[PDB]
Amino acid sequence: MSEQLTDQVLVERVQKGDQKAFNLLVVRYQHKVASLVSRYVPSGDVPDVVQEAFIKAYRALDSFRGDSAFYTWLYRIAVNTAKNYLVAQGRRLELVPRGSHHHHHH
């Protein structure tokens, strides 16, 4: 069986002010983006980057009028969040003298 609603109307409804439709939207992709983002962060940081990708997506979704599919537009939010997540902690800790906390991401 399948639902009568899709990312087409779920993205229109959240732009109408029904944030409750975004919660029902991200859960369809919460398994899909966690799979592709687990390739850019370890399984210990993958759930935190999926949430930041949905908090970052909703704020960018009010400006989405690309007349294109939502899944391609959402998948790029999750991989771009994983690449800024590791550089924001790998380039903010290398300022410590060597022999301690000298590890970084690349």
Side-chain angles (χ1 to χ4, degrees):
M1 298 301 180
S2 301
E3 300 301 296
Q4 293 182 259
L5 301 307
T6 308
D7 62 81
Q8 176 61 93
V9 52
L10 265 55
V11 171
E12 286 182 73
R13 184 164 189 178
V14 300
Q15 291 177 351
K16 240 68 73 178
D18 278 15
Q19 186 276 346
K20 61 189 180 183
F22 184 67
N23 165 79
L24 298 174
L25 178 61
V26 303
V27 64
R28 309 181 68 150
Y29 292 85
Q30 187 174 114
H31 183 251
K32 302 181 181 180
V33 308
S35 185
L36 68 84
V37 80
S38 186
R39 302 187 297 99
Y40 300 102
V41 285
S43 60
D45 297 304
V46 75
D48 186 68
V49 172
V50 168
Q51 190 72 4
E52 185 175 317
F54 291 146
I55 296 173
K56 183 183 297 179
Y58 186 68
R59 295 171 173 176
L61 193 69
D62 183 64
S63 68
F64 177 56
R65 301 90 184 274
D67 189 47
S68 187
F70 171 68
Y71 64 81
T72 306
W73 176 98
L74 179 63
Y75 293 170
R76 65 175 187 172
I77 308 301
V79 61
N80 291 352
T81 298
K83 289 176 178 294
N84 89 250
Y85 181 80
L86 294 182
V87 82
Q89 66 189 267
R91 306 303 183 193
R92 193 170 62 195
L93 187 60
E94 64 173 72
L95 294 309
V96 182
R98 301 301 182 250
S100 182
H101 301 294
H102 60 271
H103 181 63
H104 63 273
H105 301 94
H106 185 89

mmCIF file with all atom_site columns, all heavy atoms in Angstrom, residues 67-85:
data_model
loop_
_atom_site.group_PDB
_atom_site.id
_atom_site.type_symbol
_atom_site.label_atom_id
_atom_site.label_alt_id
_atom_site.label_comp_id
_atom_site.label_asym_id
_atom_site.label_entity_id
_atom_site.label_seq_id
_atom_site.pdbx_PDB_ins_code
_atom_site.Cartn_x
_atom_site.Cartn_y
_atom_site.Cartn_z
_atom_site.occupancy
_atom_site.B_iso_or_equiv
_atom_site.pdbx_formal_charge
_atom_site.auth_seq_id
_atom_site.auth_comp_id
_atom_site.auth_asym_id
_atom_site.auth_atom_id
_atom_site.pdbx_PDB_model_num
ATOM 1   N N   . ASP A 1 67 ? 11.101 23.999 -8.630  1.00 0.00 ? 67 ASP A N   1
ATOM 2   C CA  . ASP A 1 67 ? 10.216 23.252 -9.515  1.00 0.00 ? 67 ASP A CA  1
ATOM 3   C C   . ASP A 1 67 ? 10.822 21.897 -9.900  1.00 0.00 ? 67 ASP A C   1
ATOM 4   O O   . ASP A 1 67 ? 10.587 21.379 -10.992 1.00 0.00 ? 67 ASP A O   1
ATOM 5   C CB  . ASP A 1 67 ? 9.824  24.114 -10.719 1.00 0.00 ? 67 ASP A CB  1
ATOM 6   C CG  . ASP A 1 67 ? 8.720  23.467 -11.553 1.00 0.00 ? 67 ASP A CG  1
ATOM 7   O OD1 . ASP A 1 67 ? 7.728  23.005 -10.945 1.00 0.00 ? 67 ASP A OD1 1
ATOM 8   O OD2 . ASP A 1 67 ? 8.871  23.442 -12.796 1.00 0.00 ? 67 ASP A OD2 1
ATOM 9   N N   . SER A 1 68 ? 11.614 21.324 -8.988  1.00 0.00 ? 68 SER A N   1
ATOM 10  C CA  . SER A 1 68 ? 12.308 20.062 -9.191  1.00 0.00 ? 68 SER A CA  1
ATOM 11  C C   . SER A 1 68 ? 12.029 19.133 -8.013  1.00 0.00 ? 68 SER A C   1
ATOM 12  O O   . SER A 1 68 ? 11.353 19.522 -7.060  1.00 0.00 ? 68 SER A O   1
ATOM 13  C CB  . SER A 1 68 ? 13.804 20.338 -9.355  1.00 0.00 ? 68 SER A CB  1
ATOM 14  O OG  . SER A 1 68 ? 14.482 19.154 -9.719  1.00 0.00 ? 68 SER A OG  1
ATOM 15  N N   . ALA A 1 69 ? 12.542 17.903 -8.066  1.00 0.00 ? 69 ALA A N   1
ATOM 16  C CA  . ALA A 1 69 ? 12.271 16.913 -7.040  1.00 0.00 ? 69 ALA A CA  1
ATOM 17  C C   . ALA A 1 69 ? 12.907 17.297 -5.705  1.00 0.00 ? 69 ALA A C   1
ATOM 18  O O   . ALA A 1 69 ? 13.998 17.865 -5.659  1.00 0.00 ? 69 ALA A O   1
ATOM 19  C CB  . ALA A 1 69 ? 12.760 15.546 -7.514  1.00 0.00 ? 69 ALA A CB  1
ATOM 20  N N   . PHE A 1 70 ? 12.204 16.981 -4.613  1.00 0.00 ? 70 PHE A N   1
ATOM 21  C CA  . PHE A 1 70 ? 12.626 17.320 -3.267  1.00 0.00 ? 70 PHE A CA  1
ATOM 22  C C   . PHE A 1 70 ? 13.752 16.415 -2.769  1.00 0.00 ? 70 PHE A C   1
ATOM 23  O O   . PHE A 1 70 ? 14.568 16.855 -1.960  1.00 0.00 ? 70 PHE A O   1
ATOM 24  C CB  . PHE A 1 70 ? 11.410 17.206 -2.350  1.00 0.00 ? 70 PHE A CB  1
ATOM 25  C CG  . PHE A 1 70 ? 11.738 17.332 -0.880  1.00 0.00 ? 70 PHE A CG  1
ATOM 26  C CD1 . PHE A 1 70 ? 12.173 18.558 -0.358  1.00 0.00 ? 70 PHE A CD1 1
ATOM 27  C CD2 . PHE A 1 70 ? 11.617 16.215 -0.041  1.00 0.00 ? 70 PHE A CD2 1
ATOM 28  C CE1 . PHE A 1 70 ? 12.476 18.664 1.007   1.00 0.00 ? 70 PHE A CE1 1
ATOM 29  C CE2 . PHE A 1 70 ? 11.917 16.324 1.322   1.00 0.00 ? 70 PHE A CE2 1
ATOM 30  C CZ  . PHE A 1 70 ? 12.343 17.552 1.851   1.00 0.00 ? 70 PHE A CZ  1
ATOM 31  N N   . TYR A 1 71 ? 13.817 15.160 -3.227  1.00 0.00 ? 71 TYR A N   1
ATOM 32  C CA  . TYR A 1 71 ? 14.803 14.228 -2.702  1.00 0.00 ? 71 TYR A CA  1
ATOM 33  C C   . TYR A 1 71 ? 16.223 14.610 -3.119  1.00 0.00 ? 71 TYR A C   1
ATOM 34  O O   . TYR A 1 71 ? 17.150 14.441 -2.331  1.00 0.00 ? 71 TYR A O   1
ATOM 35  C CB  . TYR A 1 71 ? 14.456 12.795 -3.117  1.00 0.00 ? 71 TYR A CB  1
ATOM 36  C CG  . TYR A 1 71 ? 14.489 12.515 -4.602  1.00 0.00 ? 71 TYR A CG  1
ATOM 37  C CD1 . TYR A 1 71 ? 15.712 12.251 -5.237  1.00 0.00 ? 71 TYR A CD1 1
ATOM 38  C CD2 . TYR A 1 71 ? 13.295 12.509 -5.339  1.00 0.00 ? 71 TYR A CD2 1
ATOM 39  C CE1 . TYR A 1 71 ? 15.744 11.979 -6.612  1.00 0.00 ? 71 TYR A CE1 1
ATOM 40  C CE2 . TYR A 1 71 ? 13.320 12.234 -6.715  1.00 0.00 ? 71 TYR A CE2 1
ATOM 41  C CZ  . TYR A 1 71 ? 14.545 11.970 -7.357  1.00 0.00 ? 71 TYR A CZ  1
ATOM 42  O OH  . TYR A 1 71 ? 14.569 11.707 -8.695  1.00 0.00 ? 71 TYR A OH  1
ATOM 43  N N   . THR A 1 72 ? 16.416 15.125 -4.336  1.00 0.00 ? 72 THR A N   1
ATOM 44  C CA  . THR A 1 72 ? 17.743 15.534 -4.777  1.00 0.00 ? 72 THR A CA  1
ATOM 45  C C   . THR A 1 72 ? 18.172 16.789 -4.025  1.00 0.00 ? 72 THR A C   1
ATOM 46  O O   . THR A 1 72 ? 19.352 16.975 -3.730  1.00 0.00 ? 72 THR A O   1
ATOM 47  C CB  . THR A 1 72 ? 17.728 15.797 -6.285  1.00 0.00 ? 72 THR A CB  1
ATOM 48  O OG1 . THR A 1 72 ? 17.214 14.668 -6.957  1.00 0.00 ? 72 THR A OG1 1
ATOM 49  C CG2 . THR A 1 72 ? 19.135 16.070 -6.808  1.00 0.00 ? 72 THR A CG2 1
ATOM 50  N N   . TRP A 1 73 ? 17.201 17.651 -3.712  1.00 0.00 ? 73 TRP A N   1
ATOM 51  C CA  . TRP A 1 73 ? 17.454 18.900 -3.017  1.00 0.00 ? 73 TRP A CA  1
ATOM 52  C C   . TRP A 1 73 ? 17.727 18.653 -1.534  1.00 0.00 ? 73 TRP A C   1
ATOM 53  O O   . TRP A 1 73 ? 18.439 19.434 -0.905  1.00 0.00 ? 73 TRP A O   1
ATOM 54  C CB  . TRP A 1 73 ? 16.238 19.811 -3.208  1.00 0.00 ? 73 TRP A CB  1
ATOM 55  C CG  . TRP A 1 73 ? 16.306 21.106 -2.468  1.00 0.00 ? 73 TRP A CG  1
ATOM 56  C CD1 . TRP A 1 73 ? 16.694 22.293 -2.983  1.00 0.00 ? 73 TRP A CD1 1
ATOM 57  C CD2 . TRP A 1 73 ? 15.981 21.370 -1.068  1.00 0.00 ? 73 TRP A CD2 1
ATOM 58  N NE1 . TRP A 1 73 ? 16.638 23.269 -2.010  1.00 0.00 ? 73 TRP A NE1 1
ATOM 59  C CE2 . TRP A 1 73 ? 16.222 22.749 -0.804  1.00 0.00 ? 73 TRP A CE2 1
ATOM 60  C CE3 . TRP A 1 73 ? 15.511 20.584 0.000   1.00 0.00 ? 73 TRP A CE3 1
ATOM 61  C CZ2 . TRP A 1 73 ? 16.034 23.309 0.462   1.00 0.00 ? 73 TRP A CZ2 1
ATOM 62  C CZ3 . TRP A 1 73 ? 15.310 21.141 1.270   1.00 0.00 ? 73 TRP A CZ3 1
ATOM 63  C CH2 . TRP A 1 73 ? 15.578 22.494 1.502   1.00 0.00 ? 73 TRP A CH2 1
ATOM 64  N N   . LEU A 1 74 ? 17.172 17.575 -0.970  1.00 0.00 ? 74 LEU A N   1
ATOM 65  C CA  . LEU A 1 74 ? 17.351 17.241 0.432   1.00 0.00 ? 74 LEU A CA  1
ATOM 66  C C   . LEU A 1 74 ? 18.628 16.434 0.652   1.00 0.00 ? 74 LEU A C   1
ATOM 67  O O   . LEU A 1 74 ? 19.306 16.621 1.660   1.00 0.00 ? 74 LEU A O   1
ATOM 68  C CB  . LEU A 1 74 ? 16.132 16.448 0.907   1.00 0.00 ? 74 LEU A CB  1
ATOM 69  C CG  . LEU A 1 74 ? 16.247 16.038 2.377   1.00 0.00 ? 74 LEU A CG  1
ATOM 70  C CD1 . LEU A 1 74 ? 16.290 17.259 3.294   1.00 0.00 ? 74 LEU A CD1 1
ATOM 71  C CD2 . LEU A 1 74 ? 15.042 15.182 2.751   1.00 0.00 ? 74 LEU A CD2 1
ATOM 72  N N   . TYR A 1 75 ? 18.968 15.540 -0.281  1.00 0.00 ? 75 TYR A N   1
ATOM 73  C CA  . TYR A 1 75 ? 20.163 14.721 -0.141  1.00 0.00 ? 75 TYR A CA  1
ATOM 74  C C   . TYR A 1 75 ? 21.409 15.604 -0.095  1.00 0.00 ? 75 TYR A C   1
ATOM 75  O O   . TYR A 1 75 ? 22.379 15.253 0.578   1.00 0.00 ? 75 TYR A O   1
ATOM 76  C CB  . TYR A 1 75 ? 20.276 13.745 -1.318  1.00 0.00 ? 75 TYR A CB  1
ATOM 77  C CG  . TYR A 1 75 ? 19.229 12.650 -1.405  1.00 0.00 ? 75 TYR A CG  1
ATOM 78  C CD1 . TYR A 1 75 ? 19.166 11.871 -2.569  1.00 0.00 ? 75 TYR A CD1 1
ATOM 79  C CD2 . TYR A 1 75 ? 18.335 12.398 -0.350  1.00 0.00 ? 75 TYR A CD2 1
ATOM 80  C CE1 . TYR A 1 75 ? 18.219 10.842 -2.689  1.00 0.00 ? 75 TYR A CE1 1
ATOM 81  C CE2 . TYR A 1 75 ? 17.393 11.364 -0.457  1.00 0.00 ? 75 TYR A CE2 1
ATOM 82  C CZ  . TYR A 1 75 ? 17.331 10.583 -1.629  1.00 0.00 ? 75 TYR A CZ  1
ATOM 83  O OH  . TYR A 1 75 ? 16.415 9.580  -1.739  1.00 0.00 ? 75 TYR A OH  1
ATOM 84  N N   . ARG A 1 76 ? 21.397 16.744 -0.795  1.00 0.00 ? 76 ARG A N   1
ATOM 85  C CA  . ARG A 1 76 ? 22.554 17.627 -0.785  1.00 0.00 ? 76 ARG A CA  1
ATOM 86  C C   . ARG A 1 76 ? 22.664 18.412 0.520   1.00 0.00 ? 76 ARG A C   1
ATOM 87  O O   . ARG A 1 76 ? 23.755 18.860 0.857   1.00 0.00 ? 76 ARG A O   1
ATOM 88  C CB  . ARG A 1 76 ? 22.552 18.549 -2.008  1.00 0.00 ? 76 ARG A CB  1
ATOM 89  C CG  . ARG A 1 76 ? 21.381 19.527 -1.996  1.00 0.00 ? 76 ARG A CG  1
ATOM 90  C CD  . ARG A 1 76 ? 21.512 20.485 -3.180  1.00 0.00 ? 76 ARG A CD  1
ATOM 91  N NE  . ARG A 1 76 ? 20.504 21.547 -3.114  1.00 0.00 ? 76 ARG A NE  1
ATOM 92  C CZ  . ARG A 1 76 ? 20.487 22.606 -3.923  1.00 0.00 ? 76 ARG A CZ  1
ATOM 93  N NH1 . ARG A 1 76 ? 21.393 22.743 -4.889  1.00 0.00 ? 76 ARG A NH1 1
ATOM 94  N NH2 . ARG A 1 76 ? 19.552 23.541 -3.774  1.00 0.00 ? 76 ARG A NH2 1
ATOM 95  N N   . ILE A 1 77 ? 21.561 18.587 1.262   1.00 0.00 ? 77 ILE A N   1
ATOM 96  C CA  . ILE A 1 77 ? 21.642 19.266 2.550   1.00 0.00 ? 77 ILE A CA  1
ATOM 97  C C   . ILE A 1 77 ? 22.399 18.385 3.545   1.00 0.00 ? 77 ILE A C   1
ATOM 98  O O   . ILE A 1 77 ? 23.156 18.895 4.368   1.00 0.00 ? 77 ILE A O   1
ATOM 99  C CB  . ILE A 1 77 ? 20.244 19.573 3.116   1.00 0.00 ? 77 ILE A CB  1
ATOM 100 C CG1 . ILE A 1 77 ? 19.319 20.302 2.133   1.00 0.00 ? 77 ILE A CG1 1
ATOM 101 C CG2 . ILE A 1 77 ? 20.392 20.420 4.383   1.00 0.00 ? 77 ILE A CG2 1
ATOM 102 C CD1 . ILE A 1 77 ? 19.862 21.642 1.641   1.00 0.00 ? 77 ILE A CD1 1
ATOM 103 N N   . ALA A 1 78 ? 22.203 17.067 3.473   1.00 0.00 ? 78 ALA A N   1
ATOM 104 C CA  . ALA A 1 78 ? 22.768 16.151 4.451   1.00 0.00 ? 78 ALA A CA  1
ATOM 105 C C   . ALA A 1 78 ? 24.266 15.921 4.246   1.00 0.00 ? 78 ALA A C   1
ATOM 106 O O   . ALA A 1 78 ? 25.007 15.830 5.224   1.00 0.00 ? 78 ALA A O   1
ATOM 107 C CB  . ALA A 1 78 ? 21.997 14.834 4.394   1.00 0.00 ? 78 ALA A CB  1
ATOM 108 N N   . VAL A 1 79 ? 24.727 15.828 2.995   1.00 0.00 ? 79 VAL A N   1
ATOM 109 C CA  . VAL A 1 79 ? 26.147 15.598 2.737   1.00 0.00 ? 79 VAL A CA  1
ATOM 110 C C   . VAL A 1 79 ? 26.944 16.890 2.905   1.00 0.00 ? 79 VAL A C   1
ATOM 111 O O   . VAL A 1 79 ? 28.114 16.842 3.276   1.00 0.00 ? 79 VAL A O   1
ATOM 112 C CB  . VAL A 1 79 ? 26.342 14.967 1.352   1.00 0.00 ? 79 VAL A CB  1
ATOM 113 C CG1 . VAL A 1 79 ? 25.823 15.869 0.239   1.00 0.00 ? 79 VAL A CG1 1
ATOM 114 C CG2 . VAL A 1 79 ? 27.821 14.689 1.099   1.00 0.00 ? 79 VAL A CG2 1
ATOM 115 N N   . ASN A 1 80 ? 26.328 18.046 2.644   1.00 0.00 ? 80 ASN A N   1
ATOM 116 C CA  . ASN A 1 80 ? 27.002 19.320 2.835   1.00 0.00 ? 80 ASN A CA  1
ATOM 117 C C   . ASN A 1 80 ? 27.084 19.656 4.323   1.00 0.00 ? 80 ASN A C   1
ATOM 118 O O   . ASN A 1 80 ? 27.959 20.418 4.732   1.00 0.00 ? 80 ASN A O   1
ATOM 119 C CB  . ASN A 1 80 ? 26.267 20.413 2.059   1.00 0.00 ? 80 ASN A CB  1
ATOM 120 C CG  . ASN A 1 80 ? 26.412 20.245 0.550   1.00 0.00 ? 80 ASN A CG  1
ATOM 121 O OD1 . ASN A 1 80 ? 27.174 19.409 0.074   1.00 0.00 ? 80 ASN A OD1 1
ATOM 122 N ND2 . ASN A 1 80 ? 25.672 21.042 -0.216  1.00 0.00 ? 80 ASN A ND2 1
ATOM 123 N N   . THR A 1 81 ? 26.185 19.096 5.140   1.00 0.00 ? 81 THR A N   1
ATOM 124 C CA  . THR A 1 81 ? 26.220 19.330 6.577   1.00 0.00 ? 81 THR A CA  1
ATOM 125 C C   . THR A 1 81 ? 27.288 18.456 7.226   1.00 0.00 ? 81 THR A C   1
ATOM 126 O O   . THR A 1 81 ? 27.884 18.853 8.226   1.00 0.00 ? 81 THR A O   1
ATOM 127 C CB  . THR A 1 81 ? 24.840 19.081 7.195   1.00 0.00 ? 81 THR A CB  1
ATOM 128 O OG1 . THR A 1 81 ? 23.922 19.993 6.637   1.00 0.00 ? 81 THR A OG1 1
ATOM 129 C CG2 . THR A 1 81 ? 24.868 19.319 8.705   1.00 0.00 ? 81 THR A CG2 1
ATOM 130 N N   . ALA A 1 82 ? 27.538 17.270 6.668   1.00 0.00 ? 82 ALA A N   1
ATOM 131 C CA  . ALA A 1 82 ? 28.535 16.357 7.212   1.00 0.00 ? 82 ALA A CA  1
ATOM 132 C C   . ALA A 1 82 ? 29.943 16.857 6.910   1.00 0.00 ? 82 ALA A C   1
ATOM 133 O O   . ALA A 1 82 ? 30.867 16.603 7.681   1.00 0.00 ? 82 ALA A O   1
ATOM 134 C CB  . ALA A 1 82 ? 28.310 14.979 6.594   1.00 0.00 ? 82 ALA A CB  1
ATOM 135 N N   . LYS A 1 83 ? 30.112 17.573 5.792   1.00 0.00 ? 83 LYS A N   1
ATOM 136 C CA  . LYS A 1 83 ? 31.412 18.098 5.403   1.00 0.00 ? 83 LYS A CA  1
ATOM 137 C C   . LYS A 1 83 ? 31.735 19.379 6.167   1.00 0.00 ? 83 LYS A C   1
ATOM 138 O O   . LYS A 1 83 ? 32.908 19.668 6.394   1.00 0.00 ? 83 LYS A O   1
ATOM 139 C CB  . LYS A 1 83 ? 31.437 18.309 3.887   1.00 0.00 ? 83 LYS A CB  1
ATOM 140 C CG  . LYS A 1 83 ? 31.457 16.947 3.184   1.00 0.00 ? 83 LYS A CG  1
ATOM 141 C CD  . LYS A 1 83 ? 31.394 17.131 1.670   1.00 0.00 ? 83 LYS A CD  1
ATOM 142 C CE  . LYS A 1 83 ? 31.472 15.786 0.950   1.00 0.00 ? 83 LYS A CE  1
ATOM 143 N NZ  . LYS A 1 83 ? 32.789 15.150 1.143   1.00 0.00 ? 83 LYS A NZ  1
ATOM 144 N N   . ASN A 1 84 ? 30.721 20.152 6.574   1.00 0.00 ? 84 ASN A N   1
ATOM 145 C CA  . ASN A 1 84 ? 30.984 21.331 7.386   1.00 0.00 ? 84 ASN A CA  1
ATOM 146 C C   . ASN A 1 84 ? 31.048 20.960 8.868   1.00 0.00 ? 84 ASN A C   1
ATOM 147 O O   . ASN A 1 84 ? 31.569 21.727 9.672   1.00 0.00 ? 84 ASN A O   1
ATOM 148 C CB  . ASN A 1 84 ? 29.971 22.452 7.090   1.00 0.00 ? 84 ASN A CB  1
ATOM 149 C CG  . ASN A 1 84 ? 28.706 22.407 7.941   1.00 0.00 ? 84 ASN A CG  1
ATOM 150 O OD1 . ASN A 1 84 ? 27.627 22.117 7.441   1.00 0.00 ? 84 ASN A OD1 1
ATOM 151 N ND2 . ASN A 1 84 ? 28.823 22.695 9.234   1.00 0.00 ? 84 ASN A ND2 1
ATOM 152 N N   . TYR A 1 85 ? 30.528 19.783 9.236   1.00 0.00 ? 85 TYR A N   1
ATOM 153 C CA  . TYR A 1 85 ? 30.542 19.334 10.616  1.00 0.00 ? 85 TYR A CA  1
ATOM 154 C C   . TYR A 1 85 ? 31.942 18.877 11.028  1.00 0.00 ? 85 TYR A C   1
ATOM 155 O O   . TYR A 1 85 ? 32.390 19.172 12.136  1.00 0.00 ? 85 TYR A O   1
ATOM 156 C CB  . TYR A 1 85 ? 29.537 18.190 10.775  1.00 0.00 ? 85 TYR A CB  1
ATOM 157 C CG  . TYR A 1 85 ? 29.443 17.642 12.178  1.00 0.00 ? 85 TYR A CG  1
ATOM 158 C CD1 . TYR A 1 85 ? 28.690 18.327 13.143  1.00 0.00 ? 85 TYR A CD1 1
ATOM 159 C CD2 . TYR A 1 85 ? 30.101 16.449 12.512  1.00 0.00 ? 85 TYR A CD2 1
ATOM 160 C CE1 . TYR A 1 85 ? 28.598 17.823 14.449  1.00 0.00 ? 85 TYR A CE1 1
ATOM 161 C CE2 . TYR A 1 85 ? 30.012 15.939 13.814  1.00 0.00 ? 85 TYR A CE2 1
ATOM 162 C CZ  . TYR A 1 85 ? 29.261 16.626 14.788  1.00 0.00 ? 85 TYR A CZ  1
ATOM 163 O OH  . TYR A 1 85 ? 29.179 16.135 16.059  1.00 0.00 ? 85 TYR A OH  1
#
